[PDB]
Amino acid sequence: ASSCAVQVKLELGHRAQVRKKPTVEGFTHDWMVFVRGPEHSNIQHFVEKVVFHLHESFPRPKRVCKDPPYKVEESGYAGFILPIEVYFKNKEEPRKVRFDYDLFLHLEGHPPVNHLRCEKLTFNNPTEDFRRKLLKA
Amino acid sequence: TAXX
Numbered sequence: 001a002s003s004c005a006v007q008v009k010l011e012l013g014h015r016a017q018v019r020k021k022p023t024v025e026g027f028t029h030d031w032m033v034f035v036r037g038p039e040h041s042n043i044q045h046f047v048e049k050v051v052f053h054l055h056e057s058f059p060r061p062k063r064v065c066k067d068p069p070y071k072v073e074e075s076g077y078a079g080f081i082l083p084i085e086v087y088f089k090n091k092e093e094p095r096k097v098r099f100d101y102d103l104f105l106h107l108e109g110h111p112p113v114n115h116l117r118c119e120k121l122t123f124n125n126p127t128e129d130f131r132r133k134l135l136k137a
Numbered sequence: 138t139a140x141x
Contacts, residue, residue: 077138078139
């Protein structure tokens with residue numbers, strides 16, 4: 001007869017800059033995409049791994065990060081939808097959360113992309129293990 | 138840029 005509601009704050013984001021010189025393959029942008037916690041918080045306490053599903057046109061498109069930083073750097077020629085799966089150190093439903101991230105690129109002659117997307121997860125009545133893992137962040 |  002008592003309730004719990006844990007709330008964690010995640011930050012998804014990405015930067016994208018037009019290359020001074022495009023690569024031999026025609027890639028014209030350097031971009032990086034990241035998942036992190038605010039103000040250098042340590043989300044590893046409850047995040048097992050983070051999976052970046054790149055477009056099929058990329059070699060080894062399913063990138064995995066088991067340790068911080070949860071980022072992917074790459075060079076490319078067009079934007080796309082990047083599914084990001086965040087897996088928690090949870091043994092109960094739900095193990096991970098999915099985010100469809102709009103990784104867009106701006107044209108040359110425009111200021112580079114520095115995009116931020118704040119997300120906020122609320123877990124209700126979790127297990128005590130997951131609870132203390134979540135609350136150590 | 139263009140969407141892929």
